[PDB]
Design a protein around this ligand. Structure first.
Ligand SMILES: CCCCCCCCCCCCCCCCCC(=O)OC[C@H](CO[C@@H]1O[C@H](CO[C@H]2O[C@H](CO)[C@H](O)[C@H](O)[C@H]2O)[C@H](O)[C@H](O)[C@H]1O)OC(=O)CCCCCCCCCCCCCCCCC
Ligand SMILES: CCCCCCCCCCCCCCCCCC(=O)OC[C@H](CO[C@@H]1O[C@H](CO[C@H]2O[C@H](CO)[C@H](O)[C@H](O)[C@H]2O)[C@H](O)[C@H](O)[C@H]1O)OC(=O)CCCCCCCCCCCCCCCCC
Ligand code: CLA
Ligand code: CLA
Ligand code: CLA
Ligand code: CLA
Ligand code: CLA
Ligand code: HEC
Ligand SMILES: CC1=C(/C=C/C(C)=C/C=C/C(C)=C/C=C/C=C(C)/C=C/C=C(C)/C=C/C2=C(C)CCCC2(C)C)C(C)(C)CCC1
Ligand SMILES: CC1=C(/C=C/C(C)=C/C=C/C(C)=C/C=C/C=C(C)/C=C/C=C(C)/C=C/C2=C(C)CCCC2(C)C)C(C)(C)CCC1
Ligand SMILES: CC1=C(/C=C/C(C)=C/C=C/C(C)=C/C=C/C=C(C)/C=C/C=C(C)/C=C/C2=C(C)CCCC2(C)C)C(C)(C)CCC1
Ligand code: OEX
Lengths: 37, 32, 84, 451, 27, 192, 29, 135, 30, 334, 57
């Protein structure tokens, strides 16, 4: 478990490693806003 | 066995040195 | 020429615990025998500790003495490749 | 807005990272934001692994790949791979994740705000890809830093706590490795070891002495190779042996990383020294020898004559011979007779396993470890059902070893493909036909016939 | 909840891209 | 030690109850009615017995690795369970050991053949040919005696050369066993 | 009769030798 | 069918105690936590003789087809005849030192593993303690 | 009308037959 | 002008009927060693004890096999992952017994087919071609990497390699599904999506080009003579085939770009077989297929069997019967 | 101890404005300079304030 002064922010940590999967998908959002020009 | 071992070992390294030297002997040069 | 393991089934080996032939795992079907007395038996119908003698005598009608060479050689008295 | 459509670069959107080949400031921010992504994942996964962490359960029973790496370093683990303080795991998670915002700042800064090329603002930082002595200067800078990194591991091993030793006496313990193997005939004798069974090229490193001293040797030749590449330019035999292009050095790195991923796959699959089975679980070899031991233990406890006990085939059911002659574990685990773990070296005498050390000398911690390692084999499914493919859904177990070997095989094969892609392309690019064949000067119509 | 984290973590990726589109920034 | 060996197949006047503690046997003359195609899984080792003084020291062996599957190439391959299983040999030890042991079958009763047919497990039929053999159908476990004459170097630990005559694998009755004569060296380490 | 029929494979190698080295060549047309 | 008090009645000591749908679901999970690495499906992987069947457990010495007998096994595990004592090779509450996955098992949480082991053969059938033949 | 069969079609058509008979000879002998 | 620069003028020459190249200085003697040793082992190798338990498996033709049941039997399980050359053995007959010919063939074949891949690069670089026919050959080569080397390494024995044989292959497939549930592995399912799609898009592209050939010939001779080799006109109408196939499904499902078409023909089976070779290479380390055994259970908890539970009984059928004598212990670990 | 979560929730939220506000200001000026600098230094400040206060709880 996290140290007990950190369990308030524990649902944050539970989805914290999905963030690098979404950087890949954000390059496709950014490429789609520019229309893949 | 004692003899075929070093027979294969020399055969292997001669073909491998032929591999390594010929790609060191200017393989970027040999383009059209 | 008959299969001696199958010919062992039709005699009293294949009705009870043959004390010379059955696996050490075939003693689990009764109380008290496995694994201390089952180790002591495998290693005439058996008799040591006194409570062990009372376990054995209560089981002595369940015990058969009939040595089959296939069933015992190669350590098959302890492990015969028969699991779950 | 240079190199941002296919009108200005000639690269499409799906190869739009190739628009950054000659944009040194933008390629720097590409690499620092990506460095920030690795250090983010190092941080965020370690936090995810420690938030979902049970220090009762062993580490391999929890789907943990990164907590075993911090634990191998000798942080927050005591006797037998048991966590006594999860705070050295948490700090590694926080120092990485917070550092990812700094590399995330500097990646975003150089990519989307900074100078697009460094060739004007800083001739020290500005590089041309086909400038050969500058390309060794950055290579020499990065070699010294990896020499600094391979000496930090020696520092943690020799001064700042020691690493976890699987071959510590009485079970595994964090051990200060104070006498590392400085002997180069041992350090580079690993390099001339066969990769194949019983030899196991560098994956057979089986003590933390050669690990530390091997990282003194690697850690100082990388420093001395850094001072080499800083102070020199490439020699003439190497200038004709390489393409000097941006994609060329990428392909050489991709081919190097395919080597490393295939090797680290083999380390996490076969080695239980730098990947202790306390943290990573038993190896494939380790679990099959543990199964043969558990039934060597169980049946002799029922009074089986385990040396003379025969299999169905004529071989020893518990104890047969290796094709070199050592008394090894019977069964199919005869393929794994080259396995060394510390829960069965008290059985191994000089003929292989000693039968008299099996009868009256197998300790209950060994019966415990063999029964644990058998029921936690690195067999498992993709939905993480433990056991064989014909097993029922009760055991939620895939080893980190299986996760680490398979992921770093998927990655290492594609990095071989990516090497073949980029090495073929960068040599086609340096010769001038990667965009196609010129119709007016097609080489084959100028090349003679075959038959 | 874990979702309202991952919603605002996930939504605020394209909102960077939404802002630089509706500010005509350097997309 | 073990690291500089992986020799494990090789074995290394002397005058009350005595015991044979470590009996090694390192060997295959096959009688025509060889080579070692089994690589080096051929020696017996770590055999413990009971040297019972009577003038003759009766050696009832009990325990140890005392069987080795050996296939020799005559080109016919001849499997033999090279063994000294339950050997009772007999002769101040200077001294032969004219002993008789039992070989079992090579394959035990759990062994299945290519057609699934085995002795304690498997098909008693030939299920490939449904409406058709009986020799290969019924597996016939052999336990024929073999005779060995050890010939005793002497320290507590003594050594010399054995010679055993046993039959081969009879393939559970399916063919005829060759007479294998197994010459080789031995080492026995006697301790009271 | 069995194996020496199967050793059809020697005709394939002769076809492999003939169709590589004695093919009617591609003509630039 | 439906998980019901006819299924959740199992012998306590000659008395039956009723499990709940929370308790049976908790003790499936505590069986998969600390027991099912070896005892998956009711078998023993490290000893395929001693399955976790009720008939096997009723025939153990002391009887271990009771919930009081299975919690006495998880505090003092014996052999199948009760002669030898195996808390140094079997997980127990006498072996928190060496089986760390047993340390957080309380007296209202072992009864659910004793509950799961007894209720489950009535649920599966021959499949509990039956092995791959009965999958 | 004449039949044309170029040498490649002799070569593929012999390849078609020989690898067909390398297949089916195991079954024709059975 | 020594006989080295005259040697590299022969090795790198495109004027060779069969291109040698520097990869071919490894490829030719390894693959000739892997072909001479193969057909000798396929006809005359004495039976190999593959499973290490002294039960030899006849693989060669002279010992009562036909081509379908013939194989080179994999090296002995007693050897394991050990390097077993001819000089490891005391005699040839020992080397033949323990499956040494299998290790000779696959170490010469994989080293020679790896060097086929770079030879495919090397001719593309001598001819001025774009270079990625080698990358597409990395899809069957990884597959050969997997079943000959990688799946032995993960399983710890070259006895687990694919036998160089038609029915030995089918043994390898059956046992693999029994132990690794390869059908339920999605990487094999992407591979079937790569070869079913590969065969689809082959017959698609083969039939849309053949559908769209311009009339150049009469119906009294073959339409193949409308192509003369080296011609500059395209022999088929790409607009008609797109007009055909676009009306067949809908217009935007259709590659009206010939280059974008042939990238898709290149990439769909190659990325398919890449993932499938990654199936075998990851089930090397026992990262098995999806295990839905006893997944659907009812309110009482009774297992409601699925189709994956019917596969599990078939998987149980092969695994309790594969190598009937090799297992002495209840769990099949490797 | 709860105002350790006053600097920690001043860093899970200040990172949320500095995960938008930095690639929006960089990809769009002088106010954005005095907002990035004042907050990035505040971000380095509050990782040190959380960095000291965890040892105190
Ligand atoms: C070409 C064949 C490469 C190969 O067979 O790849 C396998 C080798 C690994 O070799 C294995 O390495 C092992 C070495 O570990 C030994 O040392 C370890 C130290 O902890 C443990 O003690 C382990 O249990 C002990 O067995 C064993 O010796 C195996 O028998 C041996 O085959 O990977 C390598 O080094 C070479 C890199 C291979 C990359 C993948 C292709
Ligand atoms: C996809 C969506 C999904 O269903 O995702 C679901 C999972 C989360 O689900 C959890 O997945 C877990 C996986 O088990 C892991 O964790 C368990 C304990 O928590 C066990 O210890 C077990 O051994 C270990 O494998 C458990 O099964 C949990 O029950 C379950 O809730 O998200 C994840 O894992 C996301 C992981 C993404 C990265 C994975 C990369 C490495 C994988 C190997 C890739 C190459 C190898 C080839 C593969 C073919
Ligand atoms: C994670 C890997 C990665 C990285 C680091 C990059 C980086 C880059 N890409 Mg590439 N790219 C990628 C993957 C990646 N890309 C993928 C997967 C694709 C296929 C969709 C592309 C396709 C592509 C194309 C077609 C182009 C690029 C371009 C670029 C460069 C400039 C972008 C720009 O200036 O426009 C401005 C960008 C934006 C306004 C988008 C804003 C995104 C921000 C930066 C997100 C990050 C914010 C971050 C969370 C904040 C952290 C710091 C904070 C804590 C303080 C930049 C170096 C361009 C280029 O070549 O430049 C010349 C270009 O034309 N990329
Ligand atoms: C560190 C490793 C690394 C790096 C820096 C690069 C970098 C590059 N690759 Mg390469 N590549 C790699 C590994 C790498 N690759 C691997 C491992 C493979 C095998 C899967 C490839 C297969 C590959 C192909 C087939 C192509 C590239 C291309 C490119 C260029 C543009 C990429 C892009 O915009 O995609 C954007 C991201 C996506 C479209 C989504 C990815 C999912 C860029 C130079 C392109 C190129 O050759 O340009 C010169 C290209 O066509 N790569
Ligand atoms: C190894 C990665 C790396 C490398 C080689 C560089 C290299 C550089 N940086 Mg960058 N940068 C990085 C990561 C990196 N940075 C990170 C992690 C941050 C966040 C702290 C930054 C934030 C940053 C800023 C704000 C600036 C630079 C600048 C520079 C340039 C001058 C350095 C100097 O003399 O001061 C040089 C190209 C300067 C520049 O580009 O000049 C216009 C500059 O103003 N860097
Ligand atoms: C790991 C990172 C790394 C990288 C990418 C490089 C890269 C390079 N090195 Mg450096 N080097 C390094 C680490 C590195 N080095 C270290 C750590 C040391 C100290 C041991 C050196 C010591 C060194 C020397 C003494 C030389 C180089 C040279 C080179 C260049 C030629 C590479 C080559 O053809 O070898 C590929 C391998 C071969 C050609 C050998 C093939 C096998 C042979 C034929 C077997 C028989 C012997 C290349 C830029 C050369 C150079 O140009 O100097 C500037 C050179 O003379 N390096
Ligand atoms: C999908 C992306 C991805 C992810 C999530 C991972 C994740 C991982 N990789 Mg992998 N890797 C990847 C892609 C990825 N990789 C690719 C594409 C390749 C090329 C094929 C590799 C090649 C590779 C190798 C060769 C290895 C890994 C390893 C690992 C594991 C540990 C990483 C590590 O410790 O780095 C370490 C961090 C650094 C090297 C940065 C410097 C850190 C310094 C030197 C540490 C000093 C510490 C000391 C105490 C300091 C004193 C204070 C981790 C699970 C390792 C492993 O254990 O595999 C089984 C390993 O050996 N990776
Ligand atoms: C693997 C190391 C095991 C774990 C984890 C658990 N058990 Fe076990 N169990 C194991 C073995 C080898 C044996 C046989 C012991 C012997 O006497 O030789 C057992 C036996 C039991 C029994 C007795 C079954 C019987 O036939 O009487 C029970 C009731 C039992 N195990 C329960 C049990 C529980 C509840 C566990 C989880 C907490 C558990 N075991 C874990 C091996 C292993
Ligand atoms: C350029 C570009 C790009 C890229 C990008 C990238 C890749 C970036 C990166 C970025 C990054 C790399 C970022 C990162 C960041 C980080 C952060 C921001 C972090 C922070 C942290 C924190 C704040 C922490 C906290 C905590 C603690 C301390 C403890 C407890 C737990 C917690 C979590 C709470 C793209 C593709 C889009 C497109 C183009 C443009
Ligand atoms: C740490 C450690 C250690 C150590 C190690 C070491 C010492 C290592 C080293 C290593 C090394 C030292 C390696 C090397 C390698 C090499 C390579 C990898 C190579 C490559 C090559 C190339 C790449 C080439 C190419 C070419 C050719 C072929 C021809 C043409 C030209 C050219 C150049 C292009 C030990 C184990 C002890 C222990 C553990 C830990
Ligand atoms: C909160 C917290 C904490 C703390 C933390 C800390 C204290 C952190 C910090 C962190 C840090 C402290 C980070 C940092 C990072 C940094 C980085 C990551 C950097 C990098 C750098 C670089 C990359 C550089 C580059 C360059 C340039 C820029 C120029 C010159 C050249 C060179 C290359 C050098 C603790 C754990 C206690 C607990 C939990 C909570
Ligand atoms: O060798 Mn061919 O297959 Ca791979 O798992 Mn264990 O070992 Mn045997 O059983 Mn299942």
């Amino acid at each position: 478990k996290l140290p007990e002064a950190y369990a308030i922010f524990d649902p944050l940590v539970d989805v914290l490693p999905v963030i690098p999967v979404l950087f890949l998908a954000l390059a496709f959002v950014w490429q789609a806003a520019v229309g893949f020009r | 066995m004692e003899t075929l071992k070093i027979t294969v070992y020399i055969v292997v390294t001669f073909f491998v040195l032929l591999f390594v030297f010929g790609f060191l002997s200017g393989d970027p040069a040999r383009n059209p | 020429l008959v299969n001696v393991v199958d010919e062992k089934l039709g005699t009293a080996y294949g009705e009870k615990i043959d004390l010379n032939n059955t696996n050490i795992a075939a003693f689990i079907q009764y109380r008290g025998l496995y694994p201390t007395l089952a180790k002591l038996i495998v290693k005439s119908v058996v008799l040591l500790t006194e409570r062990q003698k009372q376990i054995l005598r209560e089981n002595l009608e369940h015990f058969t003495v009939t040595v089959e060479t296939a069933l015992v050689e190669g350590g098959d008295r302890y492990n015969n490749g028969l699991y779950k | 807005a240079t190199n941002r459509d296919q009108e200005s670069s000639g690269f499409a959107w799906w190869a739009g990272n190739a628009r950054l080949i000659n944009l040194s400031g933008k390629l720097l921010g590409a690499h620092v934001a990506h460095a920030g992504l690795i250090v983010f994942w190092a941080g965020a996964m370690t936090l995810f692994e420690l938030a979902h962490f049970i220090p009762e359960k062993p580490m391999y029973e929890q789907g943990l790949i990164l907590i075993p790496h911090i634990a191998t370093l000798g942080w927050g683990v005591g006797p037998g791979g048991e966590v006594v303080d999860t705070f050295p795991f948490f700090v590694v998670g926080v120092v990485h994740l917070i550092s990812s915002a700094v590399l995330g700042f500097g990646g975003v800064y150089h990519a989307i705000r900074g100078p697009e090329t460094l060739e004007e603002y800083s001739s020290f930082f500005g590089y041309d890809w086909k400038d050969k002595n500058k390309m060794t200067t950055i290579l020499g800078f990065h070699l010294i830093v990896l020499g600094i990194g391979a000496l930090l591991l020696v520092a943690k091993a020799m001064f700042f706590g020691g690493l976890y030793d699987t071959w510590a006496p009485g079970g595994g313990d964090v051990r200060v490795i104070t006498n590392p193997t400085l002997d180069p005939r041992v350090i580079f004798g690993y390099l001339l070891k066969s990769p194949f069974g019983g030899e196991g090229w560098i994956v057979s490193v089986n003590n933390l002495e050669d690990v530390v001293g091997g990282h003194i040797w690697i850690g100082l030749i990388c420093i001395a190779g850094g001072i080499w590449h800083i102070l020199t330019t490439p020699f003439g035999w190497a200038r004709r042996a390489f393409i000097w292009s941006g994609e060329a050095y990428l392909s050489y790195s991709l081919g190097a990383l395919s080597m490393m991923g295939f090797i680290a796959t083999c380390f996490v699959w076969f080695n239980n020294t730098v990947y202790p089975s306390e943290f990573y679980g038993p190896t494939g070899p380790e679990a099959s020898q543990a199964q043969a031991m558990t039934f060597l233990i169980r049946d002799q406890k029922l009074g089986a004559n385990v040396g003379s006990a025969q299999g169905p085939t004529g071989l020893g059911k518990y104890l047969m011979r290796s094709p070199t002659g050592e008394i090894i574990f019977g069964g199919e685990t005869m393929r794994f007779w080259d396995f060394r773990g510390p829960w069965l070296e008290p059985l191994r005498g000089p003929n292989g396993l000693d039968l008299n050390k099996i009868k009256n000398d197998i300790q209950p911690w060994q019966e415990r470890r063999a029964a644990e390692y058998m029921t936690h084999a690195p067999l498992g499914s993709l939905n993480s059902v433990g056991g064989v493919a014909t097993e029922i859904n009760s055991v939620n177990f895939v080893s980190p070893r299986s996760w680490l070997a398979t992921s770093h095989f998927v990655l290492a094969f594609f990095f071989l493909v990516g090497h073949l892609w980029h090495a073929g392309r960068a040599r086609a690019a340096a010769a001038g036909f990667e965009k196609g064949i010129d119709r007016e000067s097609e080489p084959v119509l100028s090349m003679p016939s075959l038959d | 909840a874990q979702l309202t984290m991952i919603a605002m973590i996930g939504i605020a990726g394209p909102m960077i891209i939404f802002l630089l589109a509706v500010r005509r920034g350097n997309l | 030690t073990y690291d500089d060996i992986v020799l494990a197949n090789k074995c290394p006047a002397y005058p009350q109850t005595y015991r044979i503690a470590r009996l090694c046997l390192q060997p295959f003359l096959v009688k025509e009615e060889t080579k070692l195609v089994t690589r080096e899984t051929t020696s017996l080792d770590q055999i413990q017995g009971e040297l019972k003084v009577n003038g003759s020291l009766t050696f009832v062996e009990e325990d140890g690795i005392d069987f080795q599957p050996v296939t020799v190439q005559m080109g016919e391959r001849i499997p033999l369970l090279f063994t000294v299983k339950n050997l009772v040999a007999s002769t101040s030890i200077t001294t032969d050991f004219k002993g008789e042991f039992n070989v079992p079958s090579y394959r035990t009763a759990n062994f299945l053949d290519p057609k699934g047919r085995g002795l304690a497990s498997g098909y008693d039929s030939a299920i490939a040919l449904p409406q058709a053999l009986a020799r290969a159908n019924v597996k016939r476990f052999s336990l024929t005696k073999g005779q060995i004459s050890l010939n005793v170097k002497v320290d507590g630990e003594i050594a010399g050369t054995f010679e055993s005559e046993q039959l081969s694998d009879d393939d559970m009755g399916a063919h005829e066993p060759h007479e294998v004569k197994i010459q080789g060296v031995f080492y026995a380490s006697i301790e009271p | 009769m069995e194996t020496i029929t199967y050793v059809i494979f020697a005709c394939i190698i002769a076809l492999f030798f003939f169709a590589i080295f004695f093919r009617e060549p591609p003509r630039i047309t | 069918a439906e998980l019901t008090p006819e299924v959740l009645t199992v012998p306590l000591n000659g008395k039956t105690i009723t499990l709940t749908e929370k308790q049976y679901l908790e003790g499936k999970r505590l069986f998969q936590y600390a027991c099912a690495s070896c005892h998956v499906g009711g078998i023993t992987k490290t000893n395929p003789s001693l399955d976790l069947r009720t008939e096997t457990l009723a025939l153990a010495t002391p009887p271990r087809d009771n919930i009081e007998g299975l919690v006495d096994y998880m505090k003092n595990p014996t052999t199948y005849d009760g002669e030898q004592e195996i808390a140094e090779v079997h997980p127990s509450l006498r072996s928190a030192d060496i089986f760390p996955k047993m340390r957080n098992l309380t007296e209202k949480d072992l009864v659910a593993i004793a509950g799961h082991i007894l209720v489950e053969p009535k649920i599966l059938g021959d499949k509990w303690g039956g092995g791959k033949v009965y999958y | 009308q004449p039949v044309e069969l170029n040498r490649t079609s002799l070569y593929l058509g012999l390849l078609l037959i020989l690898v067909l008979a390398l297949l089916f000879s195991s079954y024709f002998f059975n | 002008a020594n006989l080295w620069e005259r040697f590299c003028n022969w090795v790198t020459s495109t004027d060779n009927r069969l291109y040698v190249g520097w990869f071919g200085v490894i490829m030719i003697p390894t693959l000739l060693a892997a072909t001479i040793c193969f057909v000798i082992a396929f006809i005359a190798a004495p039976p190999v004890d593959i499973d290490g338990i002294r039960e030899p498996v006849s693989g060669s033709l002279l010992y009562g096999n036909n081509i379908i049941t013939g194989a080179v039997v994999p090296s002995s399980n007693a050897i394991g992952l050990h390097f077993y050359p001819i000089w490891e053995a005391a005699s040839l007959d020992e080397w033949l017994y323990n499956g040494g010919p299998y290790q000779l063939i696959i170490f010469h074949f994989l080293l020679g087919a790896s060097c086929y891949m770079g030879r495919q690069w090397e001719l593309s670089y001598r001819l001025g071609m774009r270079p990625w026919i080698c990358v597409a050959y990395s899809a069957p080569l990884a597959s050969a990497f997997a079943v000959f080397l990688i799946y032995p390494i993960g399983q710890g024995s070259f006895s687990d390699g694919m036998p160089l044989g038609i029915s030995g292959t089918f043994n390898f497939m059956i046992v693999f599904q029994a132990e690794h549930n390869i059908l339920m592995h999605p990487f094999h399912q992407l591979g079937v999506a790569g070869v079913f799609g590969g065969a689809l898009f082959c017959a698609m592209h083969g039939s849309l080009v053949t559908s769209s050939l311009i009339r150049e010939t009469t119906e009294t001779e073959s339409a193949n003579y409308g192509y003369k080799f080296g011609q500059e006109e395209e022999t088929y109408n790409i607009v008609a085939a797109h007009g055909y196939f676009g009306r067949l499904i809908f217009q935007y499902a259709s590659f009206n770009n010939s280059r974008s078409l042939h990238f898709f023909l290149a990439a769909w089976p190659v990325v398919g077989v890449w993932f499938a070779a990654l199936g075998i290479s990851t089930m090397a380390f026992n990262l098995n297929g999806f295990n839905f055994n006893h997944s659907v259970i009812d309110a009482k908890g009774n297992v409601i069997n699925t189709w994956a539970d019917i596969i599990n009984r078939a998987n149980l059928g092969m695994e309790v019967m594969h190598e009937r004598n090799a297992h002495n212990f209840p769990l099949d670990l490797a | 101890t709860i105002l350790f979560q006053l600097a920690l929730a001043a860093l899970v939220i200040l990172s949320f404005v500095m995960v938008i506000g930095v690639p929006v200001a960089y990809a769009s000026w002088d106010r954005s300079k005095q907002l990035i600098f004042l907050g990035s230094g505040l971000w380095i400040a509050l990782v040190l304030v959380v960095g000291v206060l965890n040892f105190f709880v």
